[PDB]
Amino acid sequence: TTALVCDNGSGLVKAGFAGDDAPRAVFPSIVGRPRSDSYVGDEAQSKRGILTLKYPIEHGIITNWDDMEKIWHHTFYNELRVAPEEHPTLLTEAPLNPKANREKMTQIMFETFNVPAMYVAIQAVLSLYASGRTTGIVLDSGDGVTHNVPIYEGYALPHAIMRLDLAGRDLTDYLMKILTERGYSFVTTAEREIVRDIKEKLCYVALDFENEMATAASSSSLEKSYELPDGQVITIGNERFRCPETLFQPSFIGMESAGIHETTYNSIMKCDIDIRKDLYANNVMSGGTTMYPGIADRMQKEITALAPSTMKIKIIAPPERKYSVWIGGSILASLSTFQQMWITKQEYDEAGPSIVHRKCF
Amino acid sequence: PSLHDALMEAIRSSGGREKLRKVTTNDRS
Ligand SMILES: Nc1ncnc2c1ncn2[C@@H]1O[C@H](COP(=O)(O)OP(=O)(O)OP(=O)(O)O)[C@@H](O)[C@H]1O
Ligand SMILES: [Ca+2]
Numbered sequence A: 001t002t003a004l005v006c007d008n009g010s011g012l013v014k015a016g017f018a019g020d021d022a023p024r025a026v027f028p029s030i031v032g033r034p035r036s037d038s039y040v041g042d043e044a045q046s047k048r049g050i051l052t053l054k055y056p057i058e059h060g061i062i063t064n065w066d067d068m069e070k071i072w073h074h075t076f077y078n079e080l081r082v083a084p085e086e087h088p089t090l091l092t093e094a095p096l097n098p099k100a101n102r103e104k105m106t107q108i109m110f111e112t113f114n115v116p117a118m119y120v121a122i123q124a125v126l127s128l129y130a131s132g133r134t135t136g137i138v139l140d141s142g143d144g145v146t147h148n149v150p151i152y153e154g155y156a157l158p159h160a161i162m163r164l165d166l167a168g169r170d171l172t173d174y175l176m177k178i179l180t181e182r183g184y185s186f187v188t189t190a191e192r193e194i195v196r197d198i199k200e201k202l203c204y205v206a207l208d209f210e211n212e213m214a215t216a217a218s219s220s221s222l223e224k225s226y227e228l229p230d231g232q233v234i235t236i237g238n239e240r241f242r243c244p245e246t247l248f249q250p251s252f253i254g255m256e257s258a259g260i261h262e263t264t265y266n267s268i269m270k271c272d273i274d275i276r277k278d279l280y281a282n283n284v285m286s287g288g289t290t291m292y293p294g295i296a297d298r299m300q301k302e303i304t305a306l307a308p309s310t311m312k313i314k315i316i317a318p319p320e321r322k323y324s325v326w327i328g329g330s331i332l333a334s335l336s337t338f339q340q341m342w343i344t345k346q347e348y349d350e351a352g353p354s355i356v357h358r359k360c361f
Numbered sequence B: 001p002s003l004h005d006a007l008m009e010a011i012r013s014s015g016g017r018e019k020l021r022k023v024t025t026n027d028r029s
């Protein structure tokens, strides 16, 4: 009678039990094979150098269903150590997830894992719920994709959803590139993991790019020392803010899309004028790639410069926001009122996989 | 008058993550 919460991302699986304050298991959303039959998640990365790793979720959309089944199997049995037949399972989906995808999630849950009940919730909406809100605009940025999702009373507004096909994997790749331009060598998959750790420990968003570039050129005050696993010490400099600057200026990696301040403004402006005041004041940031220090102050500055002069702008950035989607699902699935919202196996038997559009919205 | 309305109210008044049972994460990156 304890529901499960499975938040499947492009880079990370987040899984646990509804009512808990954090997922029990967080592991890479990968399946590896020889370049046993397949390795899933934590064990596939532990042999990352001897296997072809595949990502069944790309840009937040499930695209390899066989490997996804393997991820879901690994989650239930190896990580959560539950029988899925005994637990209602809340899953999460990207914004604008194709109709056919939602149906196959349902079909696999009921027919393959024999769950008693399930549900598919939109990741960004869950993140709003974790912050205690039901109206707002979410900026959700993970490992594969970045969305602005404006939400009125629990309904995402699909005509105003913006996408940016750039997120944490691109930033890691970009930090790798500019660190090698400085002289270092990050080529192996072990070294790419070091760059990801440098990204997550030392990068930040500058309030103003040019001022910060000028400080970094004229002093050592923004340099950081990083100790490598073998004990070597390297110093990181303007790379710390150049890497996440790509979020506001995607041209750095050759993308002519708008930055996240402009997708945020353009998404508010696709919404009816009467709800824009509430959006502007309820700008929730979620996902691992919103974790950079300085990002809320920079966003505040940038949106202020785009918005009417009198508008109250508030950036909300919970300290736990790399798990905000999951925490939202943990909240929703442990509420008394939600218990009639499940799709039941009985409902599934009568209506079929397309029941998911009727009950999950 | 709507189940949806009651759910939205239940979300707003849930006290958020403080009311949730504290657990440990087995966290690989
Ligand atoms: N402290 C941090 N600073 C910067 N980036 C971080 C930090 N912590 C995690 N990340 C990045 O966040 C990403 C994973 O975030 P998240 O779990 O929200 O995405 P996902 O759900 O796997 O992917 P997506 O949402 O794009 O489908 C990784 O790129 C990771 O390196
Ligand atoms: Ca995600």
Ligand SMILES: [Ca+2]
Pocket: A249, A250, A251, A255, A256, A257
């Ligand atoms: Ca540009």
